[PDB]
Prior knowledge:
There is one protein chain. The protein has four domains: 148 residues, Calcium-transporting ATPase, cytoplasmic transduction domain A; 275 residues, Up-down Bundle (Calcium-transporting ATPase, transmembrane domain); 157 residues, HAD superfamily/HAD-like (Rossmann fold, 3-Layer(aba) Sandwich), CATH 3.40.50.1000; 185 residues, Calcium-transporting ATPase, cytoplasmic domain N. The chain is α+β, with helices and mostly antiparallel strands. The site of calcium ion (CA) has 6 residues, from helix 9.
Amino acid sequence: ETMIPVLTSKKASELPVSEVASILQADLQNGLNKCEVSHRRAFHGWNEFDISEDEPLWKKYISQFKNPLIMLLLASAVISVLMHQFDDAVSITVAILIVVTVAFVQEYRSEKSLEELSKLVPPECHCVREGKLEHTLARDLVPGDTVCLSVGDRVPADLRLFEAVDLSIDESSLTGETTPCSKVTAPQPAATNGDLASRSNIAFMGTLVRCGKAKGVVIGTGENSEFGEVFKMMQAEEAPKTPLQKSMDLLGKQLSFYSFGIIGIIMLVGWLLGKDILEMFTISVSLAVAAIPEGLPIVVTVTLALGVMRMVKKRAIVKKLPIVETLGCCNVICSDKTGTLTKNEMTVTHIFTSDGLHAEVTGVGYNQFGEVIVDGDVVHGFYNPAVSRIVEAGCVCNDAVIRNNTLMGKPTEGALIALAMKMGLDGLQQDYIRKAEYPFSSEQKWMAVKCVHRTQQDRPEICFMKGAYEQVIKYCTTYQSKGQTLTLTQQQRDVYQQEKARMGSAGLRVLALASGPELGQLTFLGLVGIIDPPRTGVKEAVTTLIASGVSIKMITGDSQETAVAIASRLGLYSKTSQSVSGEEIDAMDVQQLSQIVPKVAVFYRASPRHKMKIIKSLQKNGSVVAMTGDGVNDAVALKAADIGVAMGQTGTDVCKEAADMILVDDDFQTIMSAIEEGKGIYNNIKNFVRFQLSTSIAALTLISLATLMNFPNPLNAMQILWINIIMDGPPAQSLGVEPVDKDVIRKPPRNWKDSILTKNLILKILVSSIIIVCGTLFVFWRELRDNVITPRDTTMTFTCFVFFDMFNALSSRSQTKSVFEIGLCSNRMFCYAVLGSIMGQLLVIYFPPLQKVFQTESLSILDLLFLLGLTSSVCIVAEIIKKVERSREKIQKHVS
Length: 896
Ligand SMILES: [Ca+2]
């Protein structure tokens, strides 16, 4: 039924708007209906670049026959096959299959996580359907739809522009031209077409709209696009690696080189004396496999993805991989007023009446949560006549209303309706009938209305007056004093002026109120203090950030008094803290301000140019900044600077596409969560590195001590492989995945020039390795008195090493906190992995097939109990060492 063809960009440009609309059967005003949209979905499909088919599971299963350590293991297996030892060959083959299976599961999990770490930020756009503007994903778009383009929005697909008002889009990512090209709606000549270089009529996908508003009819989605192929071939590229990943890779390479050298030296030493060449060779190969970091980058990727997704569970979205590691190193965290530290709503805080009483108003927002307190007493309704007359004049003589906690109109007035409604006087506005109105003007700086009571129309007309103090006081001749009307004198006017000055010096926006029968004979009522209030948890968050050592810098555009009052009421201001004006920032720029920027916290009457200036100065001495901002002017401030914390609620697509991580709640409380998640990721990486190093060093020391004087070794190739999978499998992932502890927020910020392997961690590694080696050697010498026991010594030493590794994993959960504080059962999956490892060890020890495979002899209850009692000699030592360390730290802090 007249299938809609896909119009290419050149063709859609060459015919006029009407012909293109007729071809696409597109309604320019009402848009497309849902049924036709679904039909075009069924025919065309998803508006998204065709995916590249991924290799099946057996491709990856075969691909793990690379890294030829397994190749020499299979060579040893087939050599044993040719040497007529079927049992050992089949055992090593079964161990090989188990190793490749576990590596396959680990690789599948890592690749699935990496692939799933691509849907955090979907494309967004606006479309018009059935005559209504709908907010829908760009993946929904089908040709023929009408999409509205605004300032800062990202173009979702190719469109044919029919209406445009001073359009300005950036094609630098598509054409390389730094100069935006103005767009028109008239059709372009066909002869003027090579590359774009002129195409001001057709909108291209992926470009960024800089200025202007327009509407267009989409001509093509997905694969069908002229530069859609260019964008597709630009995509599917390898993302850059974070410096932490490079450091981890370097550490792994160094560890692998040292392990290979040690293994070669040990093998040569063993071959120097009389031993078995094949058994020692395969044992050395298994040890080289064990002591090589193959799960370190994998677990780093999984823990980074888990932290990013945990932040996503919170009210924050993180895009870039190498941005997360810089969250914990931030020390110059910055913020701004009107949205970050203070909700973008006005709230009245202080009320001063004509009789001089001071009233404090609690609560924030245009809601009923809050109270008005006068001299320690809560005032509701008309209990206090002085405040009641003020709120009556405010509510009756007002034009703004509040619906579902949403305000339209003047924010200063809306704060006044909120204040009046807080005590239950929302319906007082409907109780009066307005007769005459005087609208607010910038010249007069005041407004008033004349009204009478709805049910008491016989009463004389009452005029309610408000505005700036200098204008209100001119029409006021009398004032109320404890229920008595007295003439306004000069002394009371001076008192009023000094009260206004005091309020202004404290950040209060001064608004006056009055009431009377007619203009010029009005009776004054009092003053109201309007101030942008801080959010719920901004004060506590700022205090916690400052206590750790993270300096907070505040930049705003209001007056000095309001900014300094906000800083003082939050904690940013201190005894020694200056403030720099925007004009001073403009006059002198880079050289002599960096010597004063570490001791400043307030920037008022600033600008995006001043934002760039302070960013450059703060980056000159060397620090990590957290500059925020939304819109178009705050794009470079998030590009050239450090982590660009942006807002996904009131922000534009520029700060959500061409910038760093974004917030969906527009609050300051979502930064400490990201910092804690990053520090927890770092702690998990440190714990995994410590455990892996400790177990590898212990195993290598045990094997070297067995080899040195031709001592009969207790672990064969299969047992070494099982220890390796224990140290680099489900238990390794369980150690690497751990919930964050609520103590890293007090830690000082991490420096960029830091190292994972600290002195304390290294000392603990050697302590644990020495304890494990000593315990295993003691068990081996205890069992080896009769000098002839082939199966039981190996079985018991292997199970003792397994128990020691499990206890070391239990102890290495935290570095500064004992396992008792976090609880025995904190990570459910860690406990599941521990139970699975215990079950596997029991199956290996008891199952006759596993007994034949691993050369295992069944133990008894008494031996198992003795081994469990002996294997605890490391966990308790680590726990008491940590307890002593934290007690000493607490004592030193207390006596400081
Ligand atoms: Ca390994």
